[PDB]
Design a protein around this ligand. Structure first.
Ligand SMILES: [Br-]
Ligand SMILES: [Br-]
Ligand SMILES: [Br-]
Ligand SMILES: [Br-]
Ligand SMILES: [Br-]
Ligand SMILES: [Br-]
Lengths: 132, 163
Protein backbone atom coordinates (compact mmCIF):
# COMPACT_ATOMS: atom_id res chain seq x y z
CA UNK A 1 0.00 0.00 0.00
CA UNK A 2 1.64 3.27 1.34
CA UNK A 3 4.11 2.19 4.08
CA UNK A 4 7.85 2.77 4.25
CA UNK A 5 8.92 -0.47 2.68
CA UNK A 6 12.55 0.68 2.29
CA UNK A 7 12.78 1.08 6.06
CA UNK A 8 11.22 -2.38 6.57
CA UNK A 9 13.79 -4.01 4.29
CA UNK A 10 16.59 -2.14 6.05
CA UNK A 11 15.29 -3.19 9.49
CA UNK A 12 15.88 -6.85 8.66
CA UNK A 13 19.62 -6.17 8.29
CA UNK A 14 22.40 -5.14 10.68
CA UNK A 15 21.97 -7.97 13.26
CA UNK A 16 21.76 -11.73 13.24
CA UNK A 17 22.58 -13.46 10.04
CA UNK A 18 22.27 -10.59 7.58
CA UNK A 19 24.56 -8.14 9.39
CA UNK A 20 25.43 -6.17 6.29
CA UNK A 21 23.19 -3.20 5.48
CA UNK A 22 22.18 -2.64 1.86
CA UNK A 23 20.97 0.68 0.51
CA UNK A 24 17.16 0.66 0.36
CA UNK A 25 14.85 3.14 -1.43
CA UNK A 26 11.11 3.31 -2.02
CA UNK A 27 9.74 2.84 -5.51
CA UNK A 28 6.15 2.69 -6.73
CA UNK A 29 5.47 -0.60 -8.47
CA UNK A 30 2.80 -0.33 -11.14
CA UNK A 31 -0.36 -2.41 -11.45
CA UNK A 32 0.47 -5.40 -13.65
CA UNK A 33 4.23 -5.38 -12.84
CA UNK A 34 5.74 -8.87 -12.48
CA UNK A 35 8.17 -9.83 -9.72
CA UNK A 36 9.58 -13.23 -8.76
CA UNK A 37 10.06 -15.14 -5.53
CA UNK A 38 11.20 -18.51 -4.33
CA UNK A 39 8.80 -21.28 -3.54
CA UNK A 40 7.73 -22.71 -1.24
CA UNK A 41 7.99 -20.22 1.65
CA UNK A 42 6.67 -16.97 0.21
CA UNK A 43 8.01 -13.97 2.15
CA UNK A 44 8.21 -10.23 1.75
CA UNK A 45 11.27 -10.59 -0.52
CA UNK A 46 11.18 -10.67 -4.34
CA UNK A 47 13.51 -10.04 -7.29
CA UNK A 48 13.17 -8.88 -10.91
CA UNK A 49 13.33 -10.66 -14.24
CA UNK A 50 16.83 -9.33 -14.94
CA UNK A 51 18.11 -11.02 -11.75
CA UNK A 52 16.30 -14.27 -12.61
CA UNK A 53 17.71 -14.30 -16.19
CA UNK A 54 21.30 -13.57 -14.96
CA UNK A 55 21.21 -16.83 -12.89
CA UNK A 56 21.03 -18.89 -16.12
CA UNK A 57 18.83 -21.62 -14.55
CA UNK A 58 21.20 -22.18 -11.54
CA UNK A 59 19.70 -21.90 -8.03
CA UNK A 60 23.17 -21.36 -6.50
CA UNK A 61 23.84 -18.49 -8.93
CA UNK A 62 20.41 -17.00 -8.18
CA UNK A 63 20.58 -17.11 -4.40
CA UNK A 64 24.21 -16.03 -4.37
CA UNK A 65 23.23 -12.99 -6.46
CA UNK A 66 20.55 -12.14 -3.82
CA UNK A 67 22.84 -13.05 -0.85
CA UNK A 68 20.21 -15.47 0.52
CA UNK A 69 21.53 -18.44 2.51
CA UNK A 70 20.23 -21.97 1.99
CA UNK A 71 17.33 -22.70 4.33
CA UNK A 72 18.59 -24.46 7.47
CA UNK A 73 16.30 -27.50 6.78
CA UNK A 74 15.36 -27.38 3.10
CA UNK A 75 18.46 -25.81 1.46
CA UNK A 76 18.26 -23.49 -1.53
CA UNK A 77 14.75 -23.24 -3.06
CA UNK A 78 14.48 -24.95 -6.42
CA UNK A 79 11.16 -23.45 -7.61
CA UNK A 80 10.40 -19.87 -8.66
CA UNK A 81 6.96 -18.23 -8.66
CA UNK A 82 6.06 -15.23 -10.75
CA UNK A 83 3.71 -12.69 -9.12
CA UNK A 84 1.69 -9.85 -10.54
CA UNK A 85 1.18 -6.52 -8.67
CA UNK A 86 -2.59 -6.03 -8.09
CA UNK A 87 -2.43 -2.30 -7.59
CA UNK A 88 0.10 0.52 -7.47
CA UNK A 89 2.09 -0.13 -4.31
CA UNK A 90 5.32 0.97 -2.64
CA UNK A 91 8.23 -1.50 -2.56
CA UNK A 92 11.60 -1.19 -0.94
CA UNK A 93 14.36 -1.92 -3.40
CA UNK A 94 18.07 -2.00 -4.06
CA UNK A 95 21.04 -4.22 -4.70
CA UNK A 96 21.85 -7.20 -2.51
CA UNK A 97 25.58 -6.51 -2.06
CA UNK A 98 26.47 -5.78 1.57
CA UNK A 99 26.83 -9.34 2.97
CA UNK A 100 30.14 -11.27 3.27
CA UNK A 101 30.77 -12.70 -0.25
CA UNK A 102 32.47 -15.94 1.00
CA UNK A 103 29.42 -16.92 3.00
CA UNK A 104 26.56 -15.33 1.08
CA UNK A 105 27.66 -15.03 -2.54
CA UNK A 106 28.98 -11.99 -4.41
CA UNK A 107 25.48 -10.53 -4.76
CA UNK A 108 24.51 -7.84 -7.23
CA UNK A 109 20.88 -8.90 -7.74
CA UNK A 110 17.93 -6.53 -7.44
CA UNK A 111 15.72 -7.19 -4.44
CA UNK A 112 12.26 -5.90 -3.50
CA UNK A 113 10.60 -5.92 -0.07
CA UNK A 114 6.82 -5.68 0.38
CA UNK A 115 5.35 -6.32 3.84
CA UNK A 116 1.85 -6.39 2.23
CA UNK A 117 2.84 -9.22 -0.19
CA UNK A 118 -0.12 -11.46 0.90
CA UNK A 119 -2.73 -8.91 -0.30
CA UNK A 120 -0.96 -6.97 -3.11
CA UNK A 121 0.68 -9.79 -5.13
CA UNK A 122 -1.18 -12.42 -7.17
CA UNK A 123 0.72 -15.57 -8.17
CA UNK A 124 0.63 -16.03 -11.97
CA UNK A 125 1.31 -19.26 -13.87
CA UNK A 126 2.86 -22.48 -12.58
CA UNK A 127 6.02 -22.50 -10.53
CA UNK A 128 9.03 -23.32 -12.47
CA UNK A 129 11.98 -25.32 -11.64
CA UNK A 130 15.54 -24.18 -11.64
CA UNK A 131 18.62 -26.39 -11.64
CA UNK A 132 21.61 -26.61 -9.31
CA UNK B 1 24.61 -31.35 27.68
CA UNK B 2 24.32 -27.64 26.61
CA UNK B 3 26.43 -24.80 28.00
CA UNK B 4 27.63 -21.50 26.86
CA UNK B 5 30.67 -19.72 28.29
CA UNK B 6 29.54 -16.06 28.38
CA UNK B 7 33.13 -14.75 28.96
CA UNK B 8 34.56 -16.18 25.69
CA UNK B 9 31.58 -17.22 23.53
CA UNK B 10 32.20 -21.01 23.52
CA UNK B 11 29.17 -23.28 23.03
CA UNK B 12 29.25 -26.96 23.97
CA UNK B 13 26.43 -29.28 22.92
CA UNK B 14 26.10 -33.01 22.03
CA UNK B 15 29.91 -33.30 22.40
CA UNK B 16 30.54 -30.55 19.78
CA UNK B 17 32.54 -27.43 20.77
CA UNK B 18 31.97 -24.17 18.88
CA UNK B 19 34.33 -21.40 19.93
CA UNK B 20 36.50 -18.65 18.55
CA UNK B 21 39.60 -20.93 18.27
CA UNK B 22 37.65 -23.86 16.70
CA UNK B 23 39.15 -24.86 13.41
CA UNK B 24 37.80 -26.84 10.59
CA UNK B 25 39.90 -29.89 11.68
CA UNK B 26 38.58 -29.61 15.25
CA UNK B 27 34.89 -29.39 14.36
CA UNK B 28 34.46 -31.41 11.11
CA UNK B 29 35.16 -34.89 12.61
CA UNK B 30 33.74 -38.15 14.17
CA UNK B 31 30.82 -40.39 12.90
CA UNK B 32 28.75 -37.19 12.68
CA UNK B 33 27.51 -36.25 9.20
CA UNK B 34 28.72 -32.75 8.44
CA UNK B 35 27.64 -31.60 5.03
CA UNK B 36 28.52 -28.58 2.97
CA UNK B 37 25.68 -26.07 3.31
CA UNK B 38 26.08 -24.96 0.62
CA UNK B 39 28.48 -27.33 -1.09
CA UNK B 40 30.84 -25.69 -3.51
CA UNK B 41 32.06 -28.27 -6.22
CA UNK B 42 35.52 -26.58 -6.48
CA UNK B 43 35.96 -27.70 -2.86
CA UNK B 44 35.77 -24.09 -1.50
CA UNK B 45 33.03 -25.04 1.02
CA UNK B 46 33.03 -22.76 4.08
CA UNK B 47 29.64 -23.45 5.76
CA UNK B 48 28.60 -26.83 7.11
CA UNK B 49 25.41 -28.32 8.56
CA UNK B 50 24.94 -31.09 11.12
CA UNK B 51 21.68 -32.36 12.61
CA UNK B 52 21.70 -33.69 16.21
CA UNK B 53 19.20 -36.54 16.66
CA UNK B 54 19.05 -36.60 20.54
CA UNK B 55 16.42 -38.99 22.02
CA UNK B 56 15.98 -36.63 25.05
CA UNK B 57 15.22 -33.21 23.48
CA UNK B 58 11.50 -32.26 23.59
CA UNK B 59 12.00 -29.55 20.93
CA UNK B 60 13.28 -32.12 18.39
CA UNK B 61 16.36 -32.48 16.20
CA UNK B 62 18.86 -29.58 16.48
CA UNK B 63 20.09 -28.03 13.20
CA UNK B 64 23.55 -26.44 13.43
CA UNK B 65 25.26 -24.46 10.69
CA UNK B 66 28.86 -23.42 11.23
CA UNK B 67 30.79 -20.92 9.07
CA UNK B 68 34.57 -20.75 8.60
CA UNK B 69 36.91 -17.91 7.43
CA UNK B 70 38.36 -19.71 4.48
CA UNK B 71 38.35 -22.65 2.05
CA UNK B 72 40.43 -25.88 2.42
CA UNK B 73 42.78 -25.00 5.27
CA UNK B 74 42.67 -27.32 8.27
CA UNK B 75 43.22 -24.21 10.50
CA UNK B 76 40.47 -21.87 9.17
CA UNK B 77 38.69 -20.40 12.28
CA UNK B 78 34.94 -20.41 12.95
CA UNK B 79 33.52 -16.91 12.32
CA UNK B 80 29.82 -17.66 13.08
CA UNK B 81 27.35 -20.39 13.88
CA UNK B 82 23.66 -20.80 14.46
CA UNK B 83 21.32 -23.47 15.74
CA UNK B 84 17.74 -24.29 16.57
CA UNK B 85 15.63 -27.30 17.51
CA UNK B 86 13.16 -28.36 14.80
CA UNK B 87 10.00 -27.41 16.74
CA UNK B 88 11.18 -23.83 17.35
CA UNK B 89 12.93 -23.10 14.04
CA UNK B 90 10.18 -22.60 11.42
CA UNK B 91 7.33 -20.10 11.26
CA UNK B 92 6.24 -16.59 10.24
CA UNK B 93 7.35 -13.70 12.39
CA UNK B 94 6.58 -10.22 10.95
CA UNK B 95 8.88 -8.04 13.09
CA UNK B 96 12.46 -8.39 14.36
CA UNK B 97 11.02 -9.49 17.72
CA UNK B 98 8.12 -11.90 17.97
CA UNK B 99 7.04 -15.37 19.03
CA UNK B 100 9.75 -17.32 17.21
CA UNK B 101 12.67 -15.37 18.72
CA UNK B 102 10.94 -15.18 22.17
CA UNK B 103 10.36 -18.95 22.19
CA UNK B 104 13.99 -19.62 21.24
CA UNK B 105 15.26 -17.46 24.13
CA UNK B 106 12.81 -19.23 26.56
CA UNK B 107 14.05 -22.64 25.45
CA UNK B 108 17.72 -21.64 25.66
CA UNK B 109 17.18 -20.15 29.14
CA UNK B 110 15.45 -23.42 30.29
CA UNK B 111 18.50 -25.41 28.95
CA UNK B 112 21.41 -23.20 30.18
CA UNK B 113 20.17 -20.57 32.76
CA UNK B 114 21.54 -17.98 30.28
CA UNK B 115 19.25 -15.13 29.22
CA UNK B 116 20.20 -14.05 25.66
CA UNK B 117 21.51 -11.84 24.31
CA UNK B 118 25.12 -12.20 25.48
CA UNK B 119 28.16 -10.45 24.05
CA UNK B 120 31.71 -9.15 24.60
CA UNK B 121 34.92 -8.43 22.81
CA UNK B 122 34.59 -11.93 21.28
CA UNK B 123 31.21 -11.48 19.53
CA UNK B 124 27.49 -11.56 20.05
CA UNK B 125 24.89 -14.35 20.52
CA UNK B 126 21.14 -13.87 20.29
CA UNK B 127 18.00 -15.41 18.91
CA UNK B 128 17.25 -13.89 15.50
CA UNK B 129 14.80 -14.37 12.65
CA UNK B 130 15.73 -14.89 9.00
CA UNK B 131 12.88 -13.25 7.00
CA UNK B 132 14.06 -14.78 3.74
CA UNK B 133 13.90 -18.35 4.98
CA UNK B 134 11.15 -17.91 7.61
CA UNK B 135 13.37 -19.47 10.26
CA UNK B 136 14.58 -18.47 13.70
CA UNK B 137 17.87 -19.55 15.18
CA UNK B 138 20.30 -18.78 18.01
CA UNK B 139 22.93 -16.85 16.05
CA UNK B 140 26.55 -16.20 17.01
CA UNK B 141 28.64 -13.59 15.18
CA UNK B 142 32.26 -13.77 16.39
CA UNK B 143 34.67 -10.85 15.95
CA UNK B 144 36.27 -12.69 12.99
CA UNK B 145 32.98 -12.39 11.06
CA UNK B 146 33.72 -8.62 10.76
CA UNK B 147 36.32 -7.76 8.12
CA UNK B 148 36.77 -4.16 9.43
CA UNK B 149 37.02 -2.59 12.84
CA UNK B 150 34.44 0.03 11.88
CA UNK B 151 31.93 -2.66 10.88
CA UNK B 152 32.45 -4.27 14.32
CA UNK B 153 32.11 -0.95 16.22
CA UNK B 154 28.92 0.02 14.30
CA UNK B 155 27.46 -3.43 14.96
CA UNK B 156 28.29 -3.04 18.67
CA UNK B 157 26.44 0.30 18.84
CA UNK B 158 23.39 -0.99 16.87
CA UNK B 159 23.18 -4.18 18.98
CA UNK B 160 23.86 -2.72 22.46
CA UNK B 161 27.24 -4.49 22.95
CA UNK B 162 29.53 -2.96 25.62
CA UNK B 163 33.06 -4.14 26.80
BR1 LIG C 1 31.77 -8.37 4.41
BR1 LIG D 1 9.32 -27.08 22.48
BR1 LIG E 1 5.94 -10.55 14.83
BR1 LIG F 1 10.66 -4.59 13.58
BR1 LIG G 1 39.07 -6.47 11.05
BR1 LIG H 1 33.27 3.38 13.79
Amino acid sequence: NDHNQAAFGRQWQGRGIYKGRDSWSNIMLKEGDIVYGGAPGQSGFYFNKATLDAAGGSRAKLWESLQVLPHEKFGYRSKIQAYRVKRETIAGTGKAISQDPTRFGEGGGTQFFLSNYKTVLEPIDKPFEIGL
Amino acid sequence: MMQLDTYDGTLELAGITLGTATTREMLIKGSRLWEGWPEKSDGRTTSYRTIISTKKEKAGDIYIIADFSGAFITDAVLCSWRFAPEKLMMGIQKKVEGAITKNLRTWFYEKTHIQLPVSGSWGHIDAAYDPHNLTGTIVCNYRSAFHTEDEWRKYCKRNNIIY
